[PDB]
């Protein structure tokens, strides 16, 4: 994916820094699950980008015969 | 909804190295981190340090001293148990079950197994008497193994006679968290699922079990540390006199996973058989009809009560039955069939178990026969059919069902009396102006093959209609 | 990303910035790999594929009908 991954990967990074700071100040729990809730979705989204990677190869090849066909009828 | 507030706070604070420097300065000069680790334990990436952390967290919840020597080999150490994975003796046996849970993602069952091993030593002993107490425990499973060996020597039949009608019950010796359990009953309804073959590979929950083990008790009792059985009769078992023995403040208990409704006379014949009182204080006796209905409504969970109002409905492929249990029936003794619930059994020596389990088998058989009428099915206010049946007890281990003649107009009563675990006799009472309906031996065979009142009523109805 | 949590908390228990460096490295891979991202959405990319299937197939029967027609007597 494009928009969601950046939206999520920038979320993960910002969230992680705060957690370290929270650990640092000591030496909440609603956010600990919230990291896990974000954790359980980009790994699903990670294979989504990989799935479209095989997809990109498929789209380009089809055009090849589209263009040569267009020349053939022209 | 706190996500938006967290995002706003992060945006406010987003306008590091300094934090690291401050932490470093503090470092140079509790349970929260453990809670975070154990909350992150469930999704841990599979790897050796991750499983080490998982096991250490499991020990933290279980209270075991978390000590590690390597990344692959770990030792569980406590007061008197010591288990290594790759006290007062060596490892009992390398059972394949624990390896089976450990090699896969079955750590919940592994934690329950560890808790069971810990619960084996929930004793108030001084780490020496406790040690001795567990040594005695060994003697008891040796004695019950010898009992089962003798009964196997008695006849080379199938395990069905071992479970239903035999001394003590089917053995599953203790291995890991599963204690030594004894099988004494399986109902014909439970026997057939959706004809189940009863080969040696039988599950532990296929029916109900009866575990025997030791818990501390308020009294001090004389128990044999050494095995009590050394000589065996050809077909019997004889227990040699005790005292080695010493006054150890504990007792041998037989644990039932769920309570059974038992009549009062069963209780006094239980102290007649054993001698140790079952109940410390006198409980409130109630007729066992409500007790059995609440017990066998729990075999099919439902959060919503049925609101049966002692008017129970039974659905059959050709018949619809309306049942009235008719509690508080007038017995000759002047009272009703009062009953309570049993969950634990106390005993002193391994020579008491066969009679206790035989009486338990008889009571369970009678309870299942009575509760076969108990069903969750509702077919309300159906004008066709809807035969009315009334259950009325007469004596202990005896009852009767009185109902209108299927063809004629007078009443007809069928009286049941339970002789043994699988023995039930049947008698018929009919009017002077009536026709032949059924034979007592036929009803007894139907009871012995199904052990269910509605099925017996269906058979009688069909046989009377065919005439 | 959970292994990142595991080894950073192990480092905190025992004893760094390399973790954030490799997190930014994961960021540069996701920025490289979002070119193949679903920019035009799931419905449009799949529909476009079937639209090109229709285009290609229609080109096929028009060309084959042109080659297969028998004008000559």
UniProtKB/Swiss-Prot annotation, chain A:
Subcellular location: Nucleus
Chain coiled-coil ranges: 1-23
GO molecular function, one term: nuclear thyroid hormone receptor binding
GO biological process, one term: RNA polymerase II preinitiation complex assembly
List of residues that carry Phosphoserine: 7
Record GO cellular component, one term: mediator complex
Subunit structure: Component of the Mediator complex, which is composed of MED1, MED4, MED6, MED7, MED8, MED9, MED10, MED11, MED12, MED13, MED13L, MED14, MED15, MED16, MED17, MED18, MED19, MED20, MED21, MED22, MED23, MED24, MED25, MED26, MED27, MED29, MED30, MED31, CCNC, CDK8 and CDC2L6/CDK11. The MED12, MED13, CCNC and CDK8 subunits form a distinct module termed the CDK8 module. Mediator containing the CDK8 module is less active than Mediator lacking this module in supporting transcriptional activation.
Family, similarity comment: Belongs to the Mediator complex subunit 4 family.
Official protein name in the record: Mediator of RNA polymerase II transcription subunit 4
Parent-protein residues present: 26 to 108 of 270
From Swiss-Prot, chain B:
Signal peptide start and end residues: none
Interaction with the Mediator complex and THRA: annotated span: 1-467
Region (Interaction with ESR1): 4-467
PTM: Phosphorylated by MAPK1 or MAPK3 during G2/M phase which may enhance protein stability and promote entry into the nucleolus. Phosphorylation increases its interaction with PSIP1.
Tissue: Ubiquitously expressed.
Interaction with the Mediator complex, as annotated region: 82-172, 175-339
Compartments where found: Nucleus
Family: Belongs to the Mediator complex subunit 1 family.
Function: Component of the Mediator complex, a coactivator involved in the regulated transcription of nearly all RNA polymerase II-dependent genes. Mediator functions as a bridge to convey information from gene-specific regulatory proteins to the basal RNA polymerase II transcription machinery. Mediator is recruited to promoters by direct interactions with regulatory proteins and serves as a scaffold for the assembly of a functional preinitiation complex with RNA polymerase II and the general transcription factors.
Assembly information from the UniProt record: Component of the Mediator complex, which is composed of MED1, MED4, MED6, MED7, MED8, MED9, MED10, MED11, MED12, MED13, MED13L, MED14, MED15, MED16, MED17, MED18, MED19, MED20, MED21, MED22, MED23, MED24, MED25, MED26, MED27, MED29, MED30, MED31, CCNC, CDK8 and CDC2L6/CDK11. The MED12, MED13, CCNC and CDK8 subunits form a distinct module termed the CDK8 module. Mediator containing the CDK8 module is less active than Mediator lacking this module in supporting transcriptional activation.
Name by which UniProt lists this protein: Mediator of RNA polymerase II transcription subunit 1
Species per Swiss-Prot/TrEMBL record: Homo sapiens (Human)
Entire protein: shown range: 13 to 518 of 1581
From Swiss-Prot, chain C:
Modified residues (Phosphoserine): 41
Keyword Signal: no
Cellular compartment(s): Nucleus
Molecular-function GO terms, alphabetical: transcription coregulator activity
Recorded coiled-coil stretches: 43-70
Full protein stretch here: 65 to 142 of 146
Subunit details: Component of the Mediator complex, which is composed of MED1, MED4, MED6, MED7, MED8, MED9, MED10, MED11, MED12, MED13, MED13L, MED14, MED15, MED16, MED17, MED18, MED19, MED20, MED21, MED22, MED23, MED24, MED25, MED26, MED27, MED29, MED30, MED31, CCNC, CDK8 and CDC2L6/CDK11. The MED12, MED13, CCNC and CDK8 subunits form a distinct module termed the CDK8 module. Mediator containing the CDK8 module is less active than Mediator lacking this module in supporting transcriptional activation.
Family indicated by similarity: Belongs to the Mediator complex subunit 9 family.
The keyword Nucleus is annotated on this UniProt entry: yes
Keyword set, alphabetical order: Acetylation, Activator, Coiled coil, Nucleus, Phosphoprotein, Transcription, Transcription regulation
Source species, domain of life: Eukaryota
GO CC aspect terms: core mediator complex; mediator complex; nucleoplasm; nucleus
Major subcellular location class: nucleus
Known role: Component of the Mediator complex, a coactivator involved in the regulated transcription of nearly all RNA polymerase II-dependent genes. Mediator functions as a bridge to convey information from gene-specific regulatory proteins to the basal RNA polymerase II transcription machinery. Mediator is recruited to promoters by direct interactions with regulatory proteins and serves as a scaffold for the assembly of a functional preinitiation complex with RNA polymerase II and the general transcription factors.
A single GO BP: positive regulation of transcription initiation by RNA polymerase II
Gene: MED9
Protein name as annotated: Mediator of RNA polymerase II transcription subunit 9
């Amino acid at each position: 994916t494009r928009e969601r991954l950046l939206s999520a990967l920038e979320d993960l990074e910002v969230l992680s820094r705060e957690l370290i700071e929270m650990l640092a100040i000591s030496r909440e729990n609603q956010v600990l699950e919230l990291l896990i809730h974000r954790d359980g979705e980009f790994q699903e989204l990670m294979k989504l980008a990989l799935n479209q990677g095989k997809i990109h190869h498929e789209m380009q090849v089809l055009e090849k015969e589209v263009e040569k066909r267009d020349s053939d009828i022209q | 909804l706190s996500k938006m507030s967290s995002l706003l706070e992060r945006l406010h604070a987003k306008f590091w190295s300094e934090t690291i420097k401050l932490v470093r300065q503090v470092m140079e000069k509790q349970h929260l981190v453990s809670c975070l680790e154990t909350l992150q334990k469930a999704l841990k990436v599979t790897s050796l340090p991750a499983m080490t952390d998982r096991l250490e967290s499991i020990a933290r919840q279980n209270g075991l001293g978390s000590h590690l020597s390597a990344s692959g080999t770990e030792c569980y150490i406590t007061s008197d148990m010591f288990y290594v994975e790759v006290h007062h003796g060596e490892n009992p046996v390398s059972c394949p079950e624990l390896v089976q849970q450990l090699r896969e993602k079955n750590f919940d069952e592994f934690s329950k197994h560890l808790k069971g091993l810990v619960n084996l030593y929930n004793l108030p002993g001084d780490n020496k008497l406790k040690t001795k107490m567990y040594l005695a425990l060994q003697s008891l499973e040796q004695d019950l193994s010898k009992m089962a060996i003798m009964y196997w020597k008695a006849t080379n039949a199938g395990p069905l006679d071992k479970i239903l009608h035999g001394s003590v019950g089917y053995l599953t010796p203790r291995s890991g968290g599963h204690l030594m359990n004894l099988k004494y009953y399986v109902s014909p309804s439970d026997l057939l699922d959706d004809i189940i073959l009863h080969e040696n590979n039988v599950s532990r929950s296929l029916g109900m079990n009866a575990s025997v083990t030791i818990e501390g008790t308020s009294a001090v009792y004389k128990l044999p540390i050494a095995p009590l059985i050394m000589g065996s009769h050809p077909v019997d078992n004889k227990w040699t006199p005790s005292f080695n023995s010493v006054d150890l403040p504990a007792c041998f208990f037989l644990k039932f996973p769920q309570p059974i409704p038992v009549s009062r006379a069963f209780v006094q014949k239980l102290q007649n058989c054993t001698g140790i009182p079952l109940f410390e204080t006198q409980p409130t006796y109630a007729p066992l009809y409500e007790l059995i209905t609440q017990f066998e409504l729990s075999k099919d969970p439902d959060p919503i009560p049925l609101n049966h109002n002692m008017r129970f409905y039974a659905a059959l492929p050709g018949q619809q039955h309306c049942y009235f249990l008719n509690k508080d029936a007038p017995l000759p003794d002047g009272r009703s069939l009062q009953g309570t619930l049993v969950s634990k059994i106390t005993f002193q020596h391994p020579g008491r178990v066969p009679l206790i389990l035989n009486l338990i088998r008889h009571q369970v058989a009678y309870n299942t026969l009575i509760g076969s009428c108990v069903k969750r099915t509702i077919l309300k206010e159906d004008s066709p059919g809807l035969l009315q049946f009334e259950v009325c007890p007469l004596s202990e281990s005896r009852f009767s069902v009185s109902f209108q003649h299927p063809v004629n107009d007078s009443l007809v009563c069928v009286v049941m009396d339970v002789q043994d675990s699988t023995h039930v006799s049947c008698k018929l009472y009919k009017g002077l102006s009536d026709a032949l309906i059924c034979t007592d031996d036929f009803i007894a065979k139907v009871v012995q093959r199904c052990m269910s009142i509605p099925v017996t009523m269906r058979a009688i109805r069909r046989k009377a209609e065919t005439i | 990303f959970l292994p990142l949590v595991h080894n950073i908390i192990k480092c905190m228990d025992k004893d760094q910035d390399l973790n954030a460096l490799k997190s930014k490295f994961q960021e540069m891979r996701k920025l490289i790999s979002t070119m193949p991202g679903i920019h035009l959405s799931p419905e449009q990319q799949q529909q476009q594929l079937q639209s090109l299937r229709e285009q290609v197939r229609t080109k096929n029967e028009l060309l084959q009908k042109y080659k297969s027609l028998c004008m000559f007597e």
